[PDB]
Design a binder for this molecule. Structure first.
Ligand SMILES: *C(O)Cc1c(C)c2ccc(O)cc2oc1=O
Ligand SMILES: *C(O)Cc1c(C)c2ccc(O)cc2oc1=O
Lengths: 138, 15, 14, 138
């Protein structure tokens, strides 16, 4: 199951959400943490993540599972990296979290850290999963 | 409506 | 004579 | 298959030989670097490495692929350790090499460093692979 991948990403307790989304043809969340936000990702959101226009979200922001995010680093489409870092939008004073989206041949690996978790840590975890997927041609 | 996902390859080992 | 080895698990990152 | 593990252990250039050995029931070299020493390990030698008698090799030593070695540290069966450190027996004034063998549920991982490479470097390299295997119930 693609779900076995979510358990892996959630195992060390540093993250609060994770997701594997198929972005080709008919976008869909292949696996996610039940009851959180990533599960609620719509094809529209996947559309802008991989969209060709990589400048409009730097102005209006982004949304994942309906959760507003700010782009901080976009290398999603850049070979060798294929990663994009983000930060949730504080829900009125509330705490923001670090998110990292990595893209492979057929999927989008998403990860959201817990409150106060180094975003570079979230990034590495994410980056290493995508590399595992890319090695198997996924 | 999406088609069922492809069969995933073996995942990495747990921590 | 040994039997054939079982299939290996996915190796670690290169 | 198993041969891909040899590629991983040999990737950085610090070691000159490596081998994955299955030691239960019918001892066998599952994968080794072609034309070297470990590729020639025998079931009898695997017998000594994991045998019950853990004192006799200290007096006469042991061989690996016919190569005489001296045991230094032996925690092979010790839980949490599963490692044994050795050193090839210098053919006169010939150079000695550091060797470490680690044990998993189904395999033995062997590693031989190049001349002058720190034995503690070779030990970690080996130990980390055994751990990957172990965590994969192997
Ligand atoms: C079923 O999932 C139909 C569907 C498709 C194919 C779709 C493609 C691309 C984008 O951006 C949105 C889509 O929404 C859909 O419902
Ligand atoms: C084929 O490999 C037969 C064989 C076995 C089963 C064996 C078991 C245990 C030890 O110590 C040595 C062995 O040598 C063999 O040839």
């Amino acid at each position: 199951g693609w779900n076995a991948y979510i358990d892996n990403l959630m195992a060390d307790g540093t993250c609060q959400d994770a997701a594997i989304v198929g972005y080709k043809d008919s976008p869909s969340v292949w696996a996610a943490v039940p009851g959180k936000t990533f599960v609620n990702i719509t094809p529209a959101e996947v559309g802008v993540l991989v969209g060709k226009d990589r400048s409009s979200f730097y102005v209006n922001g982004l949304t994942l599972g309906g959760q507003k995010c700010s782009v901080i680093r976009d290398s999603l489409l850049q070979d060798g990296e294929f990663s994009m870092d983000l930060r949730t939008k504080s829900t009125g004073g509330a705490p923001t979290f670090n998110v990292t989206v990595t893209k492979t041949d057929k999927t989008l690996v998403l990860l959201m850290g817990k409150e106060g978790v180094h975003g570079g840590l979230i990034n590495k975890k994410c980056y290493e999963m995508a590399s595992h997927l890319r090695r198997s041609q996924y | 409506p999406p088609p069922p996902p492809p069969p995933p390859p073996p995942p990495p080992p747990p921590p």
